[PDB]
């Protein structure tokens, strides 16, 4: 029987997902104009166009964040990775939700992620590249952050600050976690043998 642990203990899927999330985050930041367009250069990934920042500290921040996400994926401790767009008052305006499920057993009847990784992931990238045509216009001056929704059961005897790979993370507060009954915009869903992933956007109502 083929199991998730058979693919290098979850490291393959964690490495593929962090590669993907880096590119997807960059593209979100471009199309939503979180940063000036001049920092992004055109590249290819998954044989499709992508737009990637050349700003060193932005780049390193995104890599550092994903460095912390990688072990959480390897231990199967991630339900969602969310790119949260915050307005100038620091309130969430929009959320790009990457909903990730890694079952312990491979799904038999589903497409092979590893034989078809470019085509499968490209689909998500192409949707992001044109999403501005289905979303509302963000107010000026938005910023972003990244929320990781884990599988760990919460337990009220808990320290807000959690250090991962020497970077301090925090339990996310009401100011970010809460959107007032948002509108859900589906972008893309995939079910493959190893990985189920859904991308959708939450927009403030």
């Amino acid at each position: 029987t083929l199991t998730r642990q058979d693919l290098n203990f979850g490291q393959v899927v964690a490495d593929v997902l962090c590669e993907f999330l880096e590119v997807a985050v960059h593209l979100i930041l471009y199309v939503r104009e979180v940063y000036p367009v001049g920092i992004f250069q055109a590249r290819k990934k998954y044989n499709v166009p992508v737009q990637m920042s050349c700003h060193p500290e932005l780049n390193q921040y995104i890599q550092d964040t994903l460095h912390c996400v990688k072990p959480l994926l390897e231990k199967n401790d991630v339900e969602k990775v969310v790119v949260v767009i915050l307005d100038k008052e620091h309130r969430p305006v929009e959320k790009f939700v990457f909903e990730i499920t890694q079952p312990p057993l491979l799904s038999i009847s589903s497409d092979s992620l590893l034989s078809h990784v470019e085509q499968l992931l490209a689909a998500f990238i192409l949707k992001i590249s044109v999403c501005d045509d289905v979303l509302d216009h963000n107010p000026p001056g938005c910023t972003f952050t990244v929320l990781v929704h884990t599988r760990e059961a919460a337990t009220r005897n808990m320290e807000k600050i959690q250090v991962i790979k020497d970077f301090p993370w925090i339990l996310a507060d009401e100011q970010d976690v809460h959107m007032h009954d948002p509108r859900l915009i589906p972008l893309k869903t995939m079910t493959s043998d190893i990985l189920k992933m859904q991308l959708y956007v939450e927009e403030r109502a």
Binding site: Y35, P36, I62, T145, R151, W169, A172
Partner: peptide, 25 residues
Amino acid sequence: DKKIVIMPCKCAPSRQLVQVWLQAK
């Protein structure tokens, strides 16, 4: 039954920081 949701304590570089870098060349 709630799960732990976490975010970085530190912000990404601000838009203005990046604007200064770009304009500088």
